[PDB]
Amino acid sequence: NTASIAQARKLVEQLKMEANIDRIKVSKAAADLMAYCEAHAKEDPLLTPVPASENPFR
Amino acid sequence: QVQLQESGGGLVQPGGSLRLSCAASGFTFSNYKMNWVRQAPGKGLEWVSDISQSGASISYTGSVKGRFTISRDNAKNTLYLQMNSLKPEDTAVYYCARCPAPFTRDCFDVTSTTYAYRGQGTQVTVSS
Amino acid sequence: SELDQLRQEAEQLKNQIRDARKACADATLSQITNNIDPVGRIQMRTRRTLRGHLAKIYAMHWGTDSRLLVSASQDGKLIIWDSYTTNKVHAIPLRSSWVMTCAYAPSGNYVACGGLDNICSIYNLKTREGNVRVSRELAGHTGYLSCCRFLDDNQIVTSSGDTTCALWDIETGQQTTTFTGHTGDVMSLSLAPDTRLFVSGACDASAKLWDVREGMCRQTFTGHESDINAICFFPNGNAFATGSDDATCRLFDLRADQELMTYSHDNIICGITSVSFSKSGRLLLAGYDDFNCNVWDALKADRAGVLAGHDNRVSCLGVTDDGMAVATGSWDSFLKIWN
Amino acid sequence: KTEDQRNEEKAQREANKKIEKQLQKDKQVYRATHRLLLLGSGKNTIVKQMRILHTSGIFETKFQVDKVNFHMFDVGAQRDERRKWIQCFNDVTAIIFVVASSSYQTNRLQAALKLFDSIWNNKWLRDTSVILFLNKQDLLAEKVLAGKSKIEDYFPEFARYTTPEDATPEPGEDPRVTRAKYFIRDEFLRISTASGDGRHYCYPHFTCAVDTENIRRVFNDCRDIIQRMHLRQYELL
Amino acid sequence: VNPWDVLLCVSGTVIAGENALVVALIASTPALRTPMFVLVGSLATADLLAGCGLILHFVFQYLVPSETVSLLTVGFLVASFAASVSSLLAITVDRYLSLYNALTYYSRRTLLGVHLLLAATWTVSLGLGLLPVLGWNCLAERAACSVVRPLARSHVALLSAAFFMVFGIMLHLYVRICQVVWRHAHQIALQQHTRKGVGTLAVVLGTFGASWLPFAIYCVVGSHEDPAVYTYATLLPATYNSMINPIIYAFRNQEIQRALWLLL
């Protein structure tokens, strides 16, 4: 039954190298996400109405 | 995270009583009907019994019905087995398997050799 | 002996990672995204309906020019459409009738195609010979194809059904790097805008971030409860949203390694088939399972619209790189363009 | 420069005309065929009988019975997690289900029963129907005659089961093997009539390992499937 | 004024609106192009033309008393009613072809027959309508005129005989259809240890057997010297069958119901 303990060893070393990482707080990521949404809101033709002259689909 | 940790299991005499209790965390419980699958030493995976989402429809296999009863308490997030009139040919590692889809009558790949929504397993051994 | 101590080490590691997740969760974005006024009702109408496929349409993809699209259907035909003038440019017949993925190369020269034949067939659109001729044929895995995307003309990454993801070179036709970390079969993988990372989601209720250089995992996001069906990056490349058959869509963040915001309704009873975003990333669209598809607001969990034009499934859905069209696939052999 | 884009759209319209002509040519080819999925169990023997009568992921067979062409797709080199690739096979006319009806995994019959259950109760296979084959009934007769591996010890319903009136006669038939074989039928039809209501039905037929009429039997089953689908669309049944 | 004419006019407006909705749902949705739906649409446009013929005839002959336009619109009515009955026959025959040639039904040699038969009956309906306008009318031979002015006895009897042959072949085709409807129902009932088929039979066939039949009877035994009240009384169930045919065929179909719900 070496397959189960092989799965166990690869799982625990996967978790080991996944563990030693640096994470930044949620609020900074949410602020960056909101800033990206507000920065590109003007050039998003899906959201704002598009005049039919410049609209390729008419 | 989705996990299923079950308890119970031990060396009992034939014809004894054993409450095979299983616990779960994470996912909701009103939906997601859950079955019972056992794997004998030297055999493949086999199904024992299943319960519905609410708890109205219960079915069992040929070698189990009239002897073992399953039940689900969705308030306590616990579903368990009940061993009665226990036969010597029922020794296996028991898994608290869970259907992969919300409130669908069909249930797929419960007895697959590899699965995701399945417990680690508790071993029950019966002998004289 | 070894197995129990390995399992208890895994449990200790998992508890440590859960504590590390909980340490950095100082707040949620539900109390920070309410300040910007909501987009309100968003209603869009079927502009063009491309007709001509026979069987169910499983996948489509757009082009770099946002003008041409490729539709792959289960009748064995792949059709290159002209979305501006409802025209068909090519109708490529396929060796296998069952396909569930198609791709358009960023250089506009190749169309990838794959399905249940365990083969990713890549065709050539350029050169002056007659018709469209298959260039290479990749077969190096033991499971059904689910979704394949193009890095550039030189390489292609495929998501397979044997719990593996593979990176394929074009000329030699060999697996440069393989990605084996999943326990269930992978369906959808989406490429980052910088063409350096990708996240693949499987039926193990989790999604894994990768790299194309070293070939190992980075993150192991576990926040779902059923089989993840679709995935798509943010346009910025620091977040991604997955949608599973648990009738819920969840948005994850690469940097805090936590699920940010879920979208759910009590009346929502059917799962998710396809997920794509917009150019600003504000309006994400979820191809649903209850015979239609929906719009979400992705900052606060509010339903901002609904698109209902199909007699069947919404199997796949894509949004152009420029953002002036929304394309949908369906099991009633009809493509529709919304604007 | 109007002539350049004028003849550009002219050539585009010509390419559209050629492509639409080819698509209309192949539309009759697609709709003139009927697609069958083979599922498992003795599938190799029956597909060899099919080949006599007539590691890739999908194997290709062709039929030409009575000037009707049939597609039959048998799956291979795929994992047992069949939940998500079987959603492709919903537009097929019938899903052929071959069941090894002698191995009673410790039990193969219960696995066959819930494979049928998952096919029946799935939310995308309700339109499609199933043709059921009870293959390997020759060894079933020997196992019934032996009596050391009886179905009674693996099925408590067999003690109180009674033989149906519709008995199929064939010389030298053991009554016990007919009782067991029709109980095996009834176990499948309990699931079949639990939820099957108009949209799809089951066709439980019995073949040996040396039968040859399975081609005509699948022919008749597809005939009844198309007829029942049309009659339900006519509000006549 | 005669209230029967205005009752027929408001009736004909009702069928015109109903099959206008039916043909709009058929033509608008791109998904409805099967040979069943094109025959349902053929019945829809034939009956829409019938309603328009009722409206135009009863507007003009109360508006302008003149024998040319009255004969022309009567011929249009004859062609429209023949188109409706013939389209019903076409739906019956493609039901029979889909049931008895079931697995080769989408082939070219079977799919050409429905379109050719549609063309044949529509052209013979135009010919039957244009026959009294061409000169086979009843104006100079004023004694030998039929009960529906200004049509002659011979052309009316030809129409009635054609209706009788169409009704007979529809009857035989329906017994051949129900010969396997009953077999499928018996196998289904034997599978588990109905009335839908016989009810559907009655509501599709008894309307044809009880609406157009008195019209054929009155044209085969009547004479023009009889009062016209009975003639209007037996012409009314033809308009009632024209009312009930879309509800029988198009409205209970799941795809048409879904299209109507999407429109609403």
PDB file of N, CA and C in Angstrom, chain D residues 28 31-32 34 68 70 164 166 186 189 192-193 199 201-202 204 219 223-224 226-228 230-231 233-237, chain E residues 36 94-95 98-99 102-106 111 177 181 183-185 187-188 190-193 196-197 200 252-255:
ATOM      1  N   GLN D  28     -28.234  16.955 -44.525  1.00  0.00           N
ATOM      2  CA  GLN D  28     -28.964  15.719 -44.787  1.00  0.00           C
ATOM      3  C   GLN D  28     -28.165  14.499 -44.361  1.00  0.00           C
ATOM      4  N   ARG D  31     -28.642  14.454 -40.454  1.00  0.00           N
ATOM      5  CA  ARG D  31     -29.987  14.100 -40.022  1.00  0.00           C
ATOM      6  C   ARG D  31     -30.444  12.748 -40.550  1.00  0.00           C
ATOM      7  N   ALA D  32     -29.775  12.207 -41.565  1.00  0.00           N
ATOM      8  CA  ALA D  32     -30.123  10.892 -42.076  1.00  0.00           C
ATOM      9  C   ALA D  32     -29.567   9.763 -41.226  1.00  0.00           C
ATOM     10  N   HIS D  34     -28.542   8.030 -37.317  1.00  0.00           N
ATOM     11  CA  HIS D  34     -29.000   7.941 -35.942  1.00  0.00           C
ATOM     12  C   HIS D  34     -27.835   7.509 -35.070  1.00  0.00           C
ATOM     13  N   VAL D  68     -30.544   2.121 -43.772  1.00  0.00           N
ATOM     14  CA  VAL D  68     -30.461   3.153 -42.747  1.00  0.00           C
ATOM     15  C   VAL D  68     -29.098   3.039 -42.083  1.00  0.00           C
ATOM     16  N   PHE D  70     -26.381   3.832 -39.122  1.00  0.00           N
ATOM     17  CA  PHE D  70     -26.363   4.042 -37.684  1.00  0.00           C
ATOM     18  C   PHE D  70     -24.958   4.384 -37.208  1.00  0.00           C
ATOM     19  N   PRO D 164     -44.013 -13.610 -13.628  1.00  0.00           N
ATOM     20  CA  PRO D 164     -45.027 -12.884 -14.398  1.00  0.00           C
ATOM     21  C   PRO D 164     -45.732 -13.797 -15.388  1.00  0.00           C
ATOM     22  N   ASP D 166     -46.340 -13.191 -18.575  1.00  0.00           N
ATOM     23  CA  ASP D 166     -45.705 -13.170 -19.893  1.00  0.00           C
ATOM     24  C   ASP D 166     -44.411 -13.970 -19.827  1.00  0.00           C
ATOM     25  N   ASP D 186     -37.412  -7.105 -13.634  1.00  0.00           N
ATOM     26  CA  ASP D 186     -38.314  -6.290 -12.824  1.00  0.00           C
ATOM     27  C   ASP D 186     -37.562  -5.292 -11.954  1.00  0.00           C
ATOM     28  N   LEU D 189     -37.014  -2.429 -14.312  1.00  0.00           N
ATOM     29  CA  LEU D 189     -38.246  -1.689 -14.597  1.00  0.00           C
ATOM     30  C   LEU D 189     -38.825  -0.955 -13.399  1.00  0.00           C
ATOM     31  N   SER D 192     -37.245   2.125 -13.931  1.00  0.00           N
ATOM     32  CA  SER D 192     -37.696   2.692 -15.200  1.00  0.00           C
ATOM     33  C   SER D 192     -39.062   3.363 -15.076  1.00  0.00           C
ATOM     34  N   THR D 193     -40.000   2.739 -14.371  1.00  0.00           N
ATOM     35  CA  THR D 193     -41.313   3.337 -14.175  1.00  0.00           C
ATOM     36  C   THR D 193     -41.440   4.113 -12.872  1.00  0.00           C
ATOM     37  N   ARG D 199     -41.581  10.902 -21.686  1.00  0.00           N
ATOM     38  CA  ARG D 199     -40.424  11.445 -22.393  1.00  0.00           C
ATOM     39  C   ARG D 199     -39.514  10.342 -22.913  1.00  0.00           C
ATOM     40  N   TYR D 201     -38.356   5.824 -22.353  1.00  0.00           N
ATOM     41  CA  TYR D 201     -38.732   4.515 -21.846  1.00  0.00           C
ATOM     42  C   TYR D 201     -37.546   3.570 -21.956  1.00  0.00           C
ATOM     43  N   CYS D 202     -37.671   2.418 -21.306  1.00  0.00           N
ATOM     44  CA  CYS D 202     -36.669   1.366 -21.344  1.00  0.00           C
ATOM     45  C   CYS D 202     -37.171   0.197 -22.180  1.00  0.00           C
ATOM     46  N   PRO D 204     -36.243  -3.605 -22.228  1.00  0.00           N
ATOM     47  CA  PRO D 204     -35.449  -4.690 -21.640  1.00  0.00           C
ATOM     48  C   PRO D 204     -35.513  -5.990 -22.425  1.00  0.00           C
ATOM     49  N   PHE D 219     -32.607  -2.140 -34.342  1.00  0.00           N
ATOM     50  CA  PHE D 219     -33.362  -1.494 -35.417  1.00  0.00           C
ATOM     51  C   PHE D 219     -34.810  -1.241 -35.009  1.00  0.00           C
ATOM     52  N   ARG D 223     -36.794   2.283 -34.146  1.00  0.00           N
ATOM     53  CA  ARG D 223     -38.066   2.566 -34.802  1.00  0.00           C
ATOM     54  C   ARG D 223     -39.128   2.978 -33.789  1.00  0.00           C
ATOM     55  N   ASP D 224     -39.257   2.214 -32.701  1.00  0.00           N
ATOM     56  CA  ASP D 224     -40.222   2.573 -31.664  1.00  0.00           C
ATOM     57  C   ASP D 224     -39.842   3.853 -30.931  1.00  0.00           C
ATOM     58  N   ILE D 226     -38.268   6.550 -32.280  1.00  0.00           N
ATOM     59  CA  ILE D 226     -38.635   7.662 -33.152  1.00  0.00           C
ATOM     60  C   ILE D 226     -40.149   7.807 -33.210  1.00  0.00           C
ATOM     61  N   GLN D 227     -40.865   6.678 -33.251  1.00  0.00           N
ATOM     62  CA  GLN D 227     -42.323   6.717 -33.282  1.00  0.00           C
ATOM     63  C   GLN D 227     -42.905   7.300 -32.000  1.00  0.00           C
ATOM     64  N   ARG D 228     -42.353   6.937 -30.843  1.00  0.00           N
ATOM     65  CA  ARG D 228     -42.885   7.449 -29.585  1.00  0.00           C
ATOM     66  C   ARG D 228     -42.573   8.926 -29.410  1.00  0.00           C
ATOM     67  N   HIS D 230     -42.250  11.089 -31.892  1.00  0.00           N
ATOM     68  CA  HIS D 230     -43.172  11.772 -32.793  1.00  0.00           C
ATOM     69  C   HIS D 230     -44.596  11.776 -32.248  1.00  0.00           C
ATOM     70  N   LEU D 231     -45.023  10.676 -31.626  1.00  0.00           N
ATOM     71  CA  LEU D 231     -46.378  10.600 -31.095  1.00  0.00           C
ATOM     72  C   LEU D 231     -46.553  11.509 -29.890  1.00  0.00           C
ATOM     73  N   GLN D 233     -44.884  14.318 -29.620  1.00  0.00           N
ATOM     74  CA  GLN D 233     -44.972  15.647 -30.213  1.00  0.00           C
ATOM     75  C   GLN D 233     -46.310  15.894 -30.894  1.00  0.00           C
ATOM     76  N   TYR D 234     -47.080  14.847 -31.169  1.00  0.00           N
ATOM     77  CA  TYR D 234     -48.402  14.988 -31.761  1.00  0.00           C
ATOM     78  C   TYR D 234     -49.508  15.027 -30.720  1.00  0.00           C
ATOM     79  N   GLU D 235     -49.152  14.974 -29.432  1.00  0.00           N
ATOM     80  CA  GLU D 235     -50.099  14.895 -28.310  1.00  0.00           C
ATOM     81  C   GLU D 235     -51.059  13.719 -28.467  1.00  0.00           C
ATOM     82  N   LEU D 236     -50.547  12.609 -28.992  1.00  0.00           N
ATOM     83  CA  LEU D 236     -51.350  11.424 -29.255  1.00  0.00           C
ATOM     84  C   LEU D 236     -51.079  10.294 -28.275  1.00  0.00           C
ATOM     85  N   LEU D 237     -50.163  10.481 -27.334  1.00  0.00           N
ATOM     86  CA  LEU D 237     -49.831   9.435 -26.376  1.00  0.00           C
ATOM     87  C   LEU D 237     -49.373  10.034 -25.051  1.00  0.00           C
TER      88      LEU D 237
ATOM     89  N   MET E  36     -42.992  19.562 -39.774  1.00  0.00           N
ATOM     90  CA  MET E  36     -44.273  19.701 -39.086  1.00  0.00           C
ATOM     91  C   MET E  36     -44.675  21.166 -38.966  1.00  0.00           C
ATOM     92  N   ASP E  94     -48.335  13.919 -43.420  1.00  0.00           N
ATOM     93  CA  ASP E  94     -46.966  13.872 -42.921  1.00  0.00           C
ATOM     94  C   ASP E  94     -46.897  13.255 -41.534  1.00  0.00           C
ATOM     95  N   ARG E  95     -47.993  13.302 -40.769  1.00  0.00           N
ATOM     96  CA  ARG E  95     -48.075  12.493 -39.557  1.00  0.00           C
ATOM     97  C   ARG E  95     -47.960  11.009 -39.888  1.00  0.00           C
ATOM     98  N   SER E  98     -44.360  10.244 -40.975  1.00  0.00           N
ATOM     99  CA  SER E  98     -43.448  10.232 -39.842  1.00  0.00           C
ATOM    100  C   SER E  98     -43.680   9.041 -38.930  1.00  0.00           C
ATOM    101  N   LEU E  99     -44.869   8.445 -38.959  1.00  0.00           N
ATOM    102  CA  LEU E  99     -45.109   7.284 -38.115  1.00  0.00           C
ATOM    103  C   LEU E  99     -44.787   5.957 -38.792  1.00  0.00           C
ATOM    104  N   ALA E 102     -40.618   5.979 -40.190  1.00  0.00           N
ATOM    105  CA  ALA E 102     -40.188   6.836 -39.089  1.00  0.00           C
ATOM    106  C   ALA E 102     -38.696   7.122 -39.122  1.00  0.00           C
ATOM    107  N   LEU E 103     -37.877   6.105 -39.343  1.00  0.00           N
ATOM    108  CA  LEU E 103     -36.443   6.293 -39.210  1.00  0.00           C
ATOM    109  C   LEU E 103     -35.763   6.694 -40.513  1.00  0.00           C
ATOM    110  N   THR E 104     -36.494   6.715 -41.629  1.00  0.00           N
ATOM    111  CA  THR E 104     -36.013   7.294 -42.876  1.00  0.00           C
ATOM    112  C   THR E 104     -36.778   8.563 -43.240  1.00  0.00           C
ATOM    113  N   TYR E 105     -37.420   9.195 -42.256  1.00  0.00           N
ATOM    114  CA  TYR E 105     -38.352  10.285 -42.523  1.00  0.00           C
ATOM    115  C   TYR E 105     -37.643  11.550 -42.980  1.00  0.00           C
ATOM    116  N   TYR E 106     -36.436  11.796 -42.486  1.00  0.00           N
ATOM    117  CA  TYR E 106     -35.717  13.014 -42.825  1.00  0.00           C
ATOM    118  C   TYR E 106     -34.932  12.897 -44.122  1.00  0.00           C
ATOM    119  N   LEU E 111     -38.788  13.731 -47.796  1.00  0.00           N
ATOM    120  CA  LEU E 111     -38.995  15.151 -47.550  1.00  0.00           C
ATOM    121  C   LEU E 111     -39.466  15.896 -48.792  1.00  0.00           C
ATOM    122  N   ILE E 177     -52.755   5.437 -38.438  1.00  0.00           N
ATOM    123  CA  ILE E 177     -51.971   6.037 -37.358  1.00  0.00           C
ATOM    124  C   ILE E 177     -52.341   5.411 -36.015  1.00  0.00           C
ATOM    125  N   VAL E 181     -50.739   3.669 -32.573  1.00  0.00           N
ATOM    126  CA  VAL E 181     -50.962   4.356 -31.298  1.00  0.00           C
ATOM    127  C   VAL E 181     -51.471   3.373 -30.248  1.00  0.00           C
ATOM    128  N   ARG E 183     -51.097   0.108 -30.294  1.00  0.00           N
ATOM    129  CA  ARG E 183     -50.050  -0.873 -30.014  1.00  0.00           C
ATOM    130  C   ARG E 183     -49.029  -0.335 -29.023  1.00  0.00           C
ATOM    131  N   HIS E 184     -48.609   0.920 -29.198  1.00  0.00           N
ATOM    132  CA  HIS E 184     -47.673   1.524 -28.257  1.00  0.00           C
ATOM    133  C   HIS E 184     -48.294   1.680 -26.877  1.00  0.00           C
ATOM    134  N   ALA E 185     -49.574   2.059 -26.817  1.00  0.00           N
ATOM    135  CA  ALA E 185     -50.250   2.175 -25.528  1.00  0.00           C
ATOM    136  C   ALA E 185     -50.370   0.822 -24.838  1.00  0.00           C
ATOM    137  N   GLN E 187     -48.333  -1.807 -25.253  1.00  0.00           N
ATOM    138  CA  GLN E 187     -47.005  -2.194 -24.781  1.00  0.00           C
ATOM    139  C   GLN E 187     -46.606  -1.409 -23.536  1.00  0.00           C
ATOM    140  N   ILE E 188     -46.956  -0.122 -23.488  1.00  0.00           N
ATOM    141  CA  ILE E 188     -46.649   0.713 -22.332  1.00  0.00           C
ATOM    142  C   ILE E 188     -47.407   0.225 -21.100  1.00  0.00           C
ATOM    143  N   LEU E 190     -48.591  -2.844 -20.654  1.00  0.00           N
ATOM    144  CA  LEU E 190     -48.079  -4.163 -20.310  1.00  0.00           C
ATOM    145  C   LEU E 190     -46.715  -4.083 -19.637  1.00  0.00           C
ATOM    146  N   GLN E 191     -45.976  -2.992 -19.857  1.00  0.00           N
ATOM    147  CA  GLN E 191     -44.676  -2.820 -19.215  1.00  0.00           C
ATOM    148  C   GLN E 191     -44.807  -2.679 -17.702  1.00  0.00           C
ATOM    149  N   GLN E 192     -45.829  -1.968 -17.234  1.00  0.00           N
ATOM    150  CA  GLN E 192     -46.058  -1.773 -15.808  1.00  0.00           C
ATOM    151  C   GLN E 192     -47.117  -2.759 -15.331  1.00  0.00           C
ATOM    152  N   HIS E 193     -46.748  -3.608 -14.379  1.00  0.00           N
ATOM    153  CA  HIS E 193     -47.672  -4.600 -13.844  1.00  0.00           C
ATOM    154  C   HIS E 193     -48.724  -3.953 -12.950  1.00  0.00           C
ATOM    155  N   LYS E 196     -55.808   9.628 -23.467  1.00  0.00           N
ATOM    156  CA  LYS E 196     -55.288  10.776 -24.202  1.00  0.00           C
ATOM    157  C   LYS E 196     -55.380  10.559 -25.705  1.00  0.00           C
ATOM    158  N   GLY E 197     -55.079   9.343 -26.167  1.00  0.00           N
ATOM    159  CA  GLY E 197     -55.105   9.072 -27.597  1.00  0.00           C
ATOM    160  C   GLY E 197     -56.497   9.145 -28.195  1.00  0.00           C
ATOM    161  N   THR E 200     -57.706  12.781 -28.091  1.00  0.00           N
ATOM    162  CA  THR E 200     -57.069  13.558 -29.144  1.00  0.00           C
ATOM    163  C   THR E 200     -57.651  13.219 -30.508  1.00  0.00           C
ATOM    164  N   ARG E 252     -51.290  23.882 -28.792  1.00  0.00           N
ATOM    165  CA  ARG E 252     -50.925  22.937 -27.742  1.00  0.00           C
ATOM    166  C   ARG E 252     -49.496  22.433 -27.866  1.00  0.00           C
ATOM    167  N   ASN E 253     -48.791  22.789 -28.935  1.00  0.00           N
ATOM    168  CA  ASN E 253     -47.404  22.374 -29.073  1.00  0.00           C
ATOM    169  C   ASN E 253     -46.524  23.139 -28.092  1.00  0.00           C
ATOM    170  N   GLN E 254     -45.523  22.437 -27.554  1.00  0.00           N
ATOM    171  CA  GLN E 254     -44.669  23.017 -26.522  1.00  0.00           C
ATOM    172  C   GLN E 254     -43.821  24.158 -27.069  1.00  0.00           C
ATOM    173  N   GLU E 255     -43.280  24.000 -28.279  1.00  0.00           N
ATOM    174  CA  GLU E 255     -42.443  25.043 -28.865  1.00  0.00           C
ATOM    175  C   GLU E 255     -43.251  26.296 -29.181  1.00  0.00           C
TER     176      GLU E 255
END
